Amino acid sequence: LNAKVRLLREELQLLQEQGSYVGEVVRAMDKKKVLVKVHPEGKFVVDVDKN
Amino acid sequence: RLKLLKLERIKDYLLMEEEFIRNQEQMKPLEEKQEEERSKVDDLRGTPMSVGTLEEIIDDNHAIVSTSVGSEHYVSILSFVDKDLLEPGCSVLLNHKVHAVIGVLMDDTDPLVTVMKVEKAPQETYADIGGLDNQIQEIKESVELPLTHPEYYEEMGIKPPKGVILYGPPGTGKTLLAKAVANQTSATFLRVVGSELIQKYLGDGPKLVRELFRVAEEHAPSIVFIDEIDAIGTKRYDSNSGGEREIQRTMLELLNQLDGFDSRGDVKVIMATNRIETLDPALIRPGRIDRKIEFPLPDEKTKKRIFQIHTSRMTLADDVTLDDLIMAKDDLSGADIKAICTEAGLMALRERRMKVTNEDFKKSKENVLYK
Ligand SMILES: Nc1ncnc2c1ncn2[C@@H]1O[C@H](COP(=O)(O)OP(=O)(O)O)[C@@H](O)[C@H]1O
Numbered sequence: 001l002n003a004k005v006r007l008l009r010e011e012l013q014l015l016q017e018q019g020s021y022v023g024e025v026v027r028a029m030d031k032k033k034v035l036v037k038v039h040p041e042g043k044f045v046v047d048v049d050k051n
Numbered sequence: 052r053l054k055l056l057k058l059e060r061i062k063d064y065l066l067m068e069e070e071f072i073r074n075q076e077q078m079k080p081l082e083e084k085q086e087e088e089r090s091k092v093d094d095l096r097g098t099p100m101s102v103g104t105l106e107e108i109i110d111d112n113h114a115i116v117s118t119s120v121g122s123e124h125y126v127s128i129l130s131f132v133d134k135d136l137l138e139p140g141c142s143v144l145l146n147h148k149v150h151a152v153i154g155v156l157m158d159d160t161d162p163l164v165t166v167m168k169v170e171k172a173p174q175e176t177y178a179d180i181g182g183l184d185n186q187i188q189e190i191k192e193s194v195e196l197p198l199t200h201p202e203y204y205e206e207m208g209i210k211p212p213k214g215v216i217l218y219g220p221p222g223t224g225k226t227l228l229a230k231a232v233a234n235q236t237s238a239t240f241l242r243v244v245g246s247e248l249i250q251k252y253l254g255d256g257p258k259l260v261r262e263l264f265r266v267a268e269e270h271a272p273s274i275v276f277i278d279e280i281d282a283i284g285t286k287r288y289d290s291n292s293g294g295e296r297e298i299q300r301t302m303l304e305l306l307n308q309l310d311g312f313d314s315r316g317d318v319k320v321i322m323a324t325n326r327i328e329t330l331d332p333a334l335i336r337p338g339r340i341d342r343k344i345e346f347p348l349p350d351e352k353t354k355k356r357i358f359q360i361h362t363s364r365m366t367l368a369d370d371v372t373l374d375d376l377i378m379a380k381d382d383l384s385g386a387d388i389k390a391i392c393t394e395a396g397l398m399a400l401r402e403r404r405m406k407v408t409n410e411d412f413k414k415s416k417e418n419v420l421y422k
């Protein structure tokens with residue numbers, strides 16, 4: 001229960017942070033960069049993280 | 052003397068470059084660190100969220116870049132760019148903040164080439180072309196040896212023939228010879244037909260014609276195979292009905308592309324026509340098209356050769372004799388011979404006997420004959 005409620009308090013606290021965009025991968029290249037489309041706006045390249 | 056010049060300087064290249072560069076490599080350092088420094092500096096040059104479309108280029112260091120939202124913005128280019136790849140209409144890369152031109156990437160084109168270029172090396176080769184030695188040698192003179200040996204013409208003075216017409220009845224291996232030329236030549240042959248360029252609306256036909264010619268010039272110094280054109284234009288008529296007027300415009304654009312004001316690359320035109328007397332007298336102008344070639348119906352010996360080459364991949368029977376088919380002294384194109392062979396095979400298959408028979412070939416003859 002304590003974990004649940006701590007989670008709730010933090011959830012309220014830091015939901016002020018903005019979310020994320022959903023992009024359609026179009027092409028990939030060297031780990032440094034990978035292409036992706038960000039609907040509705042045009043197609044770009046992104047610097048992927050360490051996933 | 053020219054050989055001496057080239058050999059001397061070539062040895063100079065080998066010695067200079069190889070020796071000095073290998074000395075530096077033996078002292079490899081002072082290169083990799085600088086390369087890594089430069090690569091990371093380029094990465095530092097903003098690579099966030101980024102893309103750009105090149106509307107046009109003003110000059111070195113300055114150009115206009117438009118985004119999907121119409122962000123036309125003019126920007127000073129960053130020299131890090133590859134440069135010289137900045138053809139208008141190219142997909143540029145732009146910094147998220149300053150929209151700095153730092154990269155360009157398309158790696159994708161209209162698949163018109165992949166549509167109009169199918170089976171670049173068909174199964175038919177000059178071995179598969181049974182007969183017509185004179186026509187074969189003339190078309191080779193016209194097309195291949197200009198390309199495979201660009202020395203004789205260069206040393207003697209003239210440039211090779213540009214357009215070559217192949218005229219004859221409906222079916223004499225015109226497309227076959229086109230295919231064989233494609234297969235034997237390393238150039239990117241282009242198949243084209245006369246029933247597609249007739250577009251629904253004004254300007255469409257000439258537009259695709261000009262695009263096809265530009266594609267031919269760009270991607271490869273190759274052949275363009277224009278099939279029947281008599282369904283197009285048929286000379287320049289009084290120009291009364293709108294459709295025929297537009298088609299006449301399409302031929303005039305073809306004529307400009309065949310020999311226009313500006314220039315023409317190393318792309319050869321090969322026309323295939325069933326009837327030639329009705330074609331534009333001006334289009335065949337000797338300056339543009341030369342080496343019109345008769346492609347007549349095969350004679351008896353040519354018919355023998357055609358049957359043999361068609362049936363090479365056909366285990367004929369011991370009793371099957373391929374002379375009753377040469378017997379017929381009537382219209383039998385190479386296509387007719389292929390149809391006869393295929394019909395004999397199919398009828399044998401239907402009547403369930405694995406081996407074809409003389410009677411089967413006979414029946415194929417009667418059922419392939421149209422008139
Ligand atoms: N040397 C040859 N001359 C003419 N036709 C041939 C020859 N060798 C084979 N053929 C046959 O001719 C057919 C192709 O004729 P094609 O080029 O379509 O004539 P057209 O283009 O006038 O319709 C093929 O089916 C092929 O089997």
Ligand SMILES: [Mg+2]
Pocket residue numbers: 223224225226227
């Ligand atoms: Mg043909």
